[PDB]
Amino acid sequence: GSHMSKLEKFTNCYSLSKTLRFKAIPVGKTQENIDNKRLLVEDEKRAEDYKGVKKLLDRYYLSFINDVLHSIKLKNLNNYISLFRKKTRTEKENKELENLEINLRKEIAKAFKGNEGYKSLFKKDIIETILPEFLDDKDEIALVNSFNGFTTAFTGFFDNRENMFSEEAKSTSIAFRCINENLTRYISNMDIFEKVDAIFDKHEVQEIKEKILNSDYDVEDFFEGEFFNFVLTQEGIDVYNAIIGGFVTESGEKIKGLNEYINLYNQKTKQKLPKFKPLYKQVLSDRESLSFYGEGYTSDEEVLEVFRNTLNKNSEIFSSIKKLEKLFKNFDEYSSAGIFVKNGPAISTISKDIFGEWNVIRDKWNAEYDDIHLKVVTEKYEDDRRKSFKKIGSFSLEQLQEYADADLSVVEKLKEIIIQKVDEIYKVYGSSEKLFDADFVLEKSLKKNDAVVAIMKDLLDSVKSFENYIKAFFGEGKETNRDESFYGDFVLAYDILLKVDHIYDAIRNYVTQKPYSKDKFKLYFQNPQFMGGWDKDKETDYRATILRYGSKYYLAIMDKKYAKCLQKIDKDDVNGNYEKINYKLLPGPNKMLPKVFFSKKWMAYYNPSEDIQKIYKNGTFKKGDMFNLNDCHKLIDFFKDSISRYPKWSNAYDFNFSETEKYKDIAGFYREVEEQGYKVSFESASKKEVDKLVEEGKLYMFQIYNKDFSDKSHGTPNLHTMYFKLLFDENNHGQIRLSGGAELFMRRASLKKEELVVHPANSPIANKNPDNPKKTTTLSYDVYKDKRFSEDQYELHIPIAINKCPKNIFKINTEVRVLLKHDDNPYVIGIDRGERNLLYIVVVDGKGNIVEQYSLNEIINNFNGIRIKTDYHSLLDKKEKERFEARQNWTSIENIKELKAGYISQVVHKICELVEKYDAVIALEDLNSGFKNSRVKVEKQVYQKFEKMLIDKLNYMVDKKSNPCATGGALKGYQITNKFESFKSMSTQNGFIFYIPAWLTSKIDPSTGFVNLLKTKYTSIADSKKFISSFDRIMYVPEEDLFEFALDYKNFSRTDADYIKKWKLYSYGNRIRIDWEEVCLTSAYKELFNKYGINYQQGDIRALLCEQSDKAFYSSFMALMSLMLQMRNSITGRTDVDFLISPVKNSDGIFYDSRNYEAQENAILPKNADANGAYNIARKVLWAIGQFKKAEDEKLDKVKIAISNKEWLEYAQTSV
RNA sequence: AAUUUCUACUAAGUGUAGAUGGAAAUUAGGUGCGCUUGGC
DNA sequence: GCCAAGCGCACCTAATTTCCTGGGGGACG
DNA sequence: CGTCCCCCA
Ligand SMILES: [Mg+2]
Ligand code: NA
Ligand code: NA
């Protein structure tokens, strides 16, 4: 139904780079020659050593960083902090704050760069001279020296390290981490300190000062602005984060920090004071913790030795177990008034064992407390009652006996509980005798031996279970009637028992490590800039090039002693030829053109007039306040005339420049050079001579391979295969360029062939898709799971540049708004997140009619009339639970990110098809990053990865099956989001993607716009009366068997957003109360009113309901109102139950019930609650489009797209 | 159950469909368990 | 039984930066 | 004096 072709305007907008990856298959004697020359062994070792030198470099860099950071006093500080906290900042003061912030980052950067040695930190000098002089170990110095003549292999690393010293507000900069992140967090903590300082006791602060600040400072100092300098190094950050978080002493004492005190205060007084934010680490610091933690275990034998020695039936830990066993079996020989349960968790624990639940003791104590202290229920009553309870330090079992049933005995019940726990220990020790004798020997190493770890953990856990049970009986410690006959023997045994605590942690810590696995390593063929680029005039330096033979492509690498061997090969006018690439790139002309033409070589050849010289010297050609259009033109003509005399470029490129007088800046000349400064063609080379080179070992050749190049391949190729071929296709006019920087790696086999699951030839294999009617496949060859990991495999990574010279430049967001404004029937794809439905889709047209709606829990695909349906929701759930249980059982934690990615790529493909079909924009929830981060715990969270892979696709969106040269084909992909720089830099619109407020998109009656604005939580009897009276009427409706509640929202607070105001609610249908029960509203109302003798038929019922005096009537009434206003009804784990039901009637007296539409195949209204949300997310974008239609084009950028809550209820309640 | 790699497959027999930006560096987060002090 | 503040250990996940280069130049045999 | 690693912007 689309009226306007919008996607076609979004091609060739901006450039991006990608990487294509291939297997590289050695040809001929290549592998033998590489083996004989030891190249792979040298490179596997160089990789190890390279990482080692990077670690030594980091030692020097960190030392250089700390010296500078320790020595810096930021100047602005007090100024910046003042403005940063000012609450009434003009736009002019906000630019001011930005300036102060830039200057703070510049103080930090310039302090780094002002050292005279600074430039040397990223050139050959740091490996040749500086790091050797800085090191002392002879072996470390010789590792660094081995890279002499090889420093340009660190060039990328040098860039990583230089990022640390940028003054820019960029994530890998020290200045950013200091100023944008930590100063902000430091300033925030200053406001919190002033709010919360009054709760801290002077002895609490004094403990922190003594035990954390060494009495060298006051806690208050770290909340003064000027003190922020202390916190620039890791050393200061650790101190500051210890003030916040405390630390653990060598004895295991947890010294409390301020956040603990805040949390303790909050829980004591039922308040919610905010807490402090810890500071982030300083870049590159190797930080050691202020908390003590005992040393672990390092070998399977240490663990087995520890486990056998500390836990066998004769060990001192097992002794204490039997000793405590005897103490409890002899309970009645001890005075029950003499032994105590400390109040709090031990009382909760004992309560749940003796009575089933943690709170029964608490409730029974309140019972007798109420009997003394009752004559209605204030907050003051329960505060005093709770304070009185909190005062009781412990309970004797005698005291506890008085809470038991006549059949119950407390002392009895306890001793059978400990007997059960000792029983279990023996039952698990019995299963453990196999590794408790000396002769036993592991066959599988512990970190990969589930069977032995299961046996240890079961034993460990049962001792933990027993240990946690007996810790309840310690009492408070200062009870007077303390049966020291009972406790003397208890404390001795208990204290030995606690020795298990270190053993439990230490074994867990060892046994859950994953076994190390080796990485692929980069190959250099003894060139530090190996394969750096493809330019013909560099072949001899880079020693890698590309060949082609029919449809197959090859990587050709010259041995360093024979760098020229391919250039001495000519065409074979008789027998076969390879095609050898001829690649010319003039990269970054604004840098290379001056470099080449004002070089000593060129100025000597070419007499450049003093005018030309001064023009470049003084920079009168650059766009700026020193510009001179005529100077610019003279320089261009110098460059143009030099090009014609530079055969290296005049013969490689078909230059065709615009007339000089037409240029505005020199940039317009550079752009033409850049675009025409790329040419790729192929030259013939004798196949015989080339193959001789390979046999002789002078040349190494790899077929550049993926399965699309197999002689057996016959289906649609990978998109990346198409990209690769298009690089060399003469119909590609620079839309996709082959880039330099390619890399070659060796990935050693990680599986042995013998251990691969095999499917023998000629034996049937089961097919898995139940909808596939061919149940079985039988092949004449073997197939092996994961075969590719069972052999060493070279891989070749090739960068490409798409839209390197973009012509179609404009504001993408603006243009989208211009199109939607002028579009007659714009379509919107609404997409809703969830965890009942990972993703739900609703497509609407320009009038908001639903065109499609469905869940993406399952991906449905068709192959030749054969359906395949994949329940990815179910797969992700299973993986989630395997990961959860693996974490709990100390077994291997499987990956989930690849399954999510596999799912999301199916989702993105379908959304792309919907975008192209309907020419539609996309509507999403403006989830801030504070909601997306709290749903990370639900490891089926898919929405962040969905956004990421969606925006990636929409940066260059291609239909594989289209003509590569047509709009939307591989050479003309649509670019309908802004180039993806970062999530943080995005706004609420990203090209075709709109982010709208999600308020009341799900919990809303789509047929009427009705929403629940009432607060129905029971708070008091008086509060419920005023609620009831605030209705205009409450009556029973005999002719419908419903209760009707007339209300004007104007009589309840927090309702100004509603538009209709007057609504009649009905007790129509059922609700799901949350375990769960189904509740029929009408009958439940009747049940409630009958319980209290209310004549609910006596017309207007409100006065009657307010005459009640029982608090349980009003709480039950408010509960029933809550259910009536609960339009969304769900059973977790019952994906069949997610319905939406409205308590209000539409125009025709119908109640909306989503179940009436989920039946239908095509439904006009949402089929459930998740579809409702997607539907109204889309409608909110429809509203914003309406706003576009109200503005002039010149003002479309200014149109607010975030509909107000008030605007949305009006919109939703007048659409119908 | 094959893959540049990932997911789902066997798709008609060494493979099929879709996806796929690498590399390096930095940093943050999440799950789980234990321990300390607490709340329900 | 659940949860909070903090410390620790094991694991997996992911955000944000940089580069995607030929040719002059020199150190070095 | 040519080769090869370095360095640039
Ligand atoms: Mg294919
Ligand atoms: Na954690
Ligand atoms: Na915790």
Side-chain angles (χ1 to χ4, degrees), chain A residues 1016 1045 1071 1073 1079-1089 1114-1126:
Chain A
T1016 62
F1045 309 73
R1071 301 292 192 273
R1073 204 184 68 86
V1079 176
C1080 162
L1081 288 175
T1082 297
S1083 84
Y1085 276 105
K1086 287 182 197 160
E1087 194 189 316
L1088 169 62
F1089 296 137
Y1114 293 101
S1115 51
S1116 277
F1117 183 84
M1118 297 298 140
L1120 285 183
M1121 220 79 12
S1122 304
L1123 291 183
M1124 179 170 54
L1125 291 156
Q1126 171 184 293

Side-chain angles (χ1 to χ4, degrees), chain A residues 147-159:
Chain A
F147 282 88
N148 289 164
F150 218 84
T151 62
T152 49
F154 295 86
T155 300
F157 182 67
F158 286 156
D159 295 350

Side-chain angles (χ1 to χ4, degrees), chain A residues 137 139-193:
Chain A
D137 181 306
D139 286 333
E140 285 173 346
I141 293 177
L143 183 74
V144 170
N145 286 335
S146 75
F147 282 88
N148 289 164
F150 218 84
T151 62
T152 49
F154 295 86
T155 300
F157 182 67
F158 286 156
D159 295 350
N160 301 126
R161 287 290 166 277
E162 275 186 67
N163 287 340
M164 304 184 322
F165 299 108
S166 173
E167 67 188 40
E168 303 190 73
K170 300 192 154 162
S171 76
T172 59
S173 138
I174 292 175
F176 178 78
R177 162 61 44 92
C178 292
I179 300 296
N180 291 71
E181 294 184 313
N182 274 355
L183 185 54
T184 294
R185 296 172 77 96
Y186 187 100
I187 298 178
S188 183
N189 291 337
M190 296 168 59
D191 290 328
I192 292 180
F193 189 84

Side-chain angles (χ1 to χ4, degrees), chain A residues 1021-1025 1027-1034 1045-1046 1052 1100-1108 1113-1114 1117-1118 1121:
Chain A
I1021 282 177
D1023 276 341
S1024 316
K1025 286 178 186 185
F1027 179 89
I1028 298 153
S1029 345
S1030 305
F1031 287 79
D1032 311 32
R1033 185 177 54 166
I1034 298 173
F1045 309 73
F1052 303 76
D1100 193 341
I1101 265 345
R1102 266 176 311 151
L1104 208 43
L1105 311 185
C1106 293
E1107 283 177 48
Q1108 300 310 303
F1113 160 77
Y1114 293 101
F1117 183 84
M1118 297 298 140
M1121 220 79 12

Side-chain angles (χ1 to χ4, degrees), chain A residues 16 85 270 292 310 315 384 539 565 588 629 726 831 990 1144 1166:
Chain A
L16 58 162
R85 293 159 100 198
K270 316 277 87 197
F292 173 80
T310 53
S315 67
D384 291 359
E539 190 159 308
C565 67
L629 185 49
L726 286 170
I831 303 182
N990 193 358
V1144 160

